């Protein structure tokens, strides 16, 4: 049962910095033969896991030299000499050398970059979804920096709570922000029992709170 | 040009089975040992079978020794995983895996197959258009989508004009729902002055119910 | 974030006029010049023209002075391009662009616009598929897609299975036929243990001729 | 009058490898403000350009350090200090200081890797193509390396010619190979006046041509 243990648990760099991310294992993991099959791997939501390093610094073929491993006995580390939007991913070592093989616990990375404000969009309840006796207002927030970001709903000045739920997509690749939703869910009957709806934003490139809303 | 291809998973109740399949292309699969890796929802990779070439040499970790039972068919290039009871905790995505002659463990992949263990049966989703409005315009920019709501199991894929459309595009990860069913929303952002000349759909596709919805969406 | 969205092109006859509009969100517009850039099939960029943010300062290459005319709405984020007296050669992918503040010409595109001045007359292509047999095998690898012929003129767009399919495609580059007409095929490649472990429809689209079609793709012969 | 020549038209190079495109400007290219507005641009096919490089040396926000530019006078450059498989595209050179602007002819840069041997593809013509009174018999060859590649078509062993055409995708961004397309076309009477297609695919991957075929009818 050798454990691997990575550090960071998360990490954020500006586009151009040195990052490195440390592994390190229970117990030496040196194979019988001699070889000690310690790996790297990069993964994005959704994607199936690509092979980074092998063999502690064997780079697999076609992946970039801005890429490296190092180590030995029980401690390694997987080092990216040029930071990039595009790293942006979950890295996590392996262990083959002992069975049974296992994986550390991942470690995130993430862009550092100039805070930028969001668009704020705001969707009422589509008319063939009432038909379906539900209503579903959606709160979007677009391209913004940092993460965090503060999201209210309001009926009729109400400030809800327990009726909403709220999704965040991974660091854009390109411009490093983020995008998110707030959607709030009522019943047919409930909604129509109201006016005023509105989502209040808060975030740091807001001078002060900003909220968009309709009645109908 | 090596591909790997897995399928078999599909929505099993807790304590039935399920067998996976994996068909392999592109290199000689009698010369490989091959492997099985799983991630949970949310969660790591871990390893979950191997067998060599040849000699039906096989492992597992705890957790799935006993249950599983990792095969092939050299004649056909595929790789199975018999899976019996199973358990809600057995929930995740199945990959399949091929290593290199000089060492490493998992260096193609195939897309992986989606297992869920639940007594929930699968649910398609229904494909709601979020309009652009003056209520969706903002900085010049203006917001449309589709929201698809109230499926099961994960997951629900999105393109928008099949795929031609990816700019400004944002697919939202999906949210479980106190209902129990997971609901999704992808939008797009356009400059609000050009609504009225380009046409909008977003593909939405939920295999594990064998649904596809192209909803249109109009301003 | 910022955005540019192009629109108008089109198949147009030898003399005709075209208008092209850029709609563009994310930014200050009236504080930037803006710009036209095309691109001739198989060919380099050409600057086709430029704006004042305010001012009505433009200017173009010789090969567009006096028949194109550059103009905005600092009102509605649009630039437009009013092409007048089109002739075979400025077919081609008109792009918008906008620099930046400290010396840049193009840091910013659209997607692109498609146009074509032709006196041949547009022509939707027909799609017949390539179905996967054992003679579309060979290393345990399977292959399968569709053939785009005989249309007229660029460009037809391919997906497979809405977008959801990408892995092991291959969309060729249109050729011209010595018909006058071009031709493509869309193909992928999958173990040969799969095929039926999924459908395949190859999706095309041939906006001149109105064309929006779905082949689905199936095995047959020896 | 200020013409702009780049120089090569085409280059490839290894992984990791150090790259210099140059670009000549007729005359001495300095705005009368004093700076030298000369740009750099990347693109790939069916996709806008992208800036990366601007007033001869300033590397445009995003862009990858290991890309740079210099130069002056008449003679200035373009570098990459660390190709990687996703640079293969066209790159093209801008004159903005002295009007009328002008780009370069472009230079299109190519990865060097290992001769990787292509799989062939035969498909016969589908029934509602004969129907048609043509018939269009496609070969394929999937993923390789180098690019050359001689693709020959023989009916009935009388070899062709003049009567089919290729088509080469561009070098893939990941694998760095390349897959083409051959397409023998004929009308339905002289199609059916024979019994066996065969293309005969010669390429420094195979040790002798690799032919494969089908017989109007059944293997
Ligand atoms: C192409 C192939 O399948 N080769 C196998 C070899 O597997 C390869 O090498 C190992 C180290 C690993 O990187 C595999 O992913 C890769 O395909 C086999 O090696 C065994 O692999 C299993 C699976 O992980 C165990 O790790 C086992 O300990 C390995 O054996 C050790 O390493 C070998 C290279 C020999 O030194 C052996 O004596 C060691 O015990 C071998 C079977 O050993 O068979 C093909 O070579
Ligand atoms: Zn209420
Ligand atoms: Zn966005
Ligand atoms: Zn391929
Ligand atoms: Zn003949």
């Known amino acids: 049962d050798i454990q691997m243990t990575q550090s960071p648990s998360s990490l954020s760099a500006s586009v151009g910095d040195r990052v490195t991310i440390t592994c390190?294992?229970?117990?030496?993991?040196?194979?019988?033969?001699?070889?000690?099959?310690?790996?790297?791997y990069q993964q994005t939501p959704g994607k199936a896991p690509k092979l980074?390093?092998?063999?502690?610094?064997?780079?697999?073929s076609g992946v970039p030299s801005r890429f490296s491993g190092s180590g030995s006995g029980t401690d390694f580390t997987f080092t990216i000499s040029s930071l990039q939007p595009e790293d942006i991913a979950t890295?996590?070592?392996?262990?083959?050398?002992?069975?049974?093989?296992?994986?550390?616990?991942g470690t995130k990375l993430q862009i550092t970059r100039t805070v930028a404000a969001p668009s704020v969009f705001i969707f009422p309840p589509s008319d063939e979804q009432l038909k379906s006796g539900t209503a579903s207002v959606v709160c979007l927030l677009n391209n913004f920096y940092p993460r965090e970001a503060k999201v209210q709903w309001k009926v009729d000045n109400a400030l809800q709570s327990g009726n909403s739920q709220e999704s965040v997509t991974e660091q854009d690749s390109k411009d490093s922000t983020y995008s998110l939703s707030s959607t709030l869910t009522l019943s047919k009957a409930d909604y129509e029992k109201h006016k005023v709806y509105a989502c209040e934003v808060t975030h740091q490139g807001l001078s002060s709170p900003v909220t968009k809303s309709f009645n109908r | 040009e090596v591909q790997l291809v897995e399928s078999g998973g599909g929505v099993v109740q807790p304590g039935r089975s399920l067998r996976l399949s994996c068909?392999?292309?592109?290199?000689?699969?009698?010369?490989?040992?091959?492997?099985?890796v799983r991630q949970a929802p949310g969660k790591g990779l871990e390893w979950?079978?191997?067998?060599?070439?040849?000699?039906?040499?096989?492992?597992?970790?705890d957790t799935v020794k006993g249950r599983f039972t990792i095969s092939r068919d050299n004649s056909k290039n595929t790789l199975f995983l018999q899976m019996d009871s199973l358990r809600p905790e057995d929930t995740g995505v199945?990959?399949?895996?091929?290593?290199?002659?000089?060492?490493?463990?998992?260096?193609?992949?195939?897309?992986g197959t989606p297992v869920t263990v639940s007594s929930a049966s699968t649910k398609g989703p229904s494909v709601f258009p979020l309009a652009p409005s003056s209520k969706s315009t903002s900085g010049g920019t203006a917001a449309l989508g589709c929201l698809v709501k109230d499926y099961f199991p994960q997951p629900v894929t999105v393109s928008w004009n099949s795929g031609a459309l990816t700019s400004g595009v944002h697919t939202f990860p999906a949210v479980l729902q106190s209902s129990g069913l997971y609901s999704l929303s992808s939008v797009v952002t356009v400059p609000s002055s050009s609504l009225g000349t380009q046409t909008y759909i977003c593909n939405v596709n939920h295999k594990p119910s064998n649904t596809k919805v192209d909803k249109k969406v109009e301003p | 974030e910022v955005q540019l969205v192009e629109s108008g092109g089109g198949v147009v006859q030898p003399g005709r006029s075209l208008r092209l509009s850029c709609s563009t969100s994310?930014?200050?517009?009236?504080?930037?010049?803006m710009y036209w850039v095309r691109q001739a099939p198989g060919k380099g960029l050409e600057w086709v023209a430029y704006?004042?943010?305010?001012?009505?300062?433009?200017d173009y290459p010789d090969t567009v002075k006096g028949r194109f005319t550059i103009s905005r709405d600092n009102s509605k984020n649009t630039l437009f391009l009013q092409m007048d007296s089109l002739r075979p050669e400025d077919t081609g992918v008109y792009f918008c662009?906008?620099?930046?503040?400290?010396?840049?010409?193009?840091?910013?595109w659209g997607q692109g616009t498609p146009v074509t001045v032709s006196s041949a007359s547009t022509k939707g292509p027909s799609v017949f598929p390539l179905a996967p047999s054992s003679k579309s095998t060979s290393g345990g690898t399977a292959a399968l897609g569709c053939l785009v012929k005989d249309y007229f003129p660029q460009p037809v767009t391919v997906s497979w299975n809405s977008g959801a399919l990408t892995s092991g495609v291959h969309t060729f580059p249109a050729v011209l036929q010595s018909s006058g007409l071009y031709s493509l095929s869309s193909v992928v490649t999958v173990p040969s243990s799969s095929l039926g472990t999924q459908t395949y429809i190859c999706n095309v689209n041939h906006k001149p001729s109105n064309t929006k079609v779905d082949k689905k793709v199936e095995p047959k012969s020896c | 009058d200020i013409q702009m020549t780049q120089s090569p038209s085409s280059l490839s190079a290894s992984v990791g490898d150090r790259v210099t495109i140059t670009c000549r400007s007729s005359?001495?290219?300095?705005?009368?403000?004093?700076?030298?507005?000369l740009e750099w641009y990347q693109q790939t096919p069916g996709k806008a350009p992208k800036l990366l490089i601007y007033?001869?040396?300033n590397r445009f926000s995003g862009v990858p350090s290991r890309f740079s530019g210099s130069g002056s006078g008449t003679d200035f450059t373009f570098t990459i200090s660390s190709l990687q498989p996703e640079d293969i595209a066209t790159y093209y050179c801008?004159?903005?200081?002295?009007?009328?602007?002008?780009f370069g002819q472009g230079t299109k840069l190519q990865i060097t890797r290992t001769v990787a041997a292509p799989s062939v593809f035969i498909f016969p013509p589908s029934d509602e193509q004969l129907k048609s009174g043509t018939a269009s018999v496609v070969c394929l060859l999937n993923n390789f390396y180098p690019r050359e590649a001689k693709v020959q078509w023989k009916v009935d062993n009388a070899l062709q010619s003049g009567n089919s055409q290729e088509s080469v995708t561009e070098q893939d961004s990941k694998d760095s190979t390349y897959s083409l397309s051959s397409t023998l076309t004929l009308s339905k009477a002289d199609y059916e006046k024979h019994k066996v297609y065969a293309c005969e695919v010669t390429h420094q991957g195979l040790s002798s041509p690799v032919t494969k075929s089908f017989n109007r009818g059944e293997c």
């Open positions: 994310g930014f200050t517009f009236s504080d930037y010049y």
């Open positions: 007033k001869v040396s």
């Open positions: 662009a906008r620099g930046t503040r400290d010396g840049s010409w193009f840091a910013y």
């Open positions: 704006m004042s943010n305010v001012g009505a300062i433009t």
């Open positions: 005359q001495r290219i300095v705005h009368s403000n004093g700076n030298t507005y």
């Open positions: 801008f004159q903005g200081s002295h009007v009328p602007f002008t």
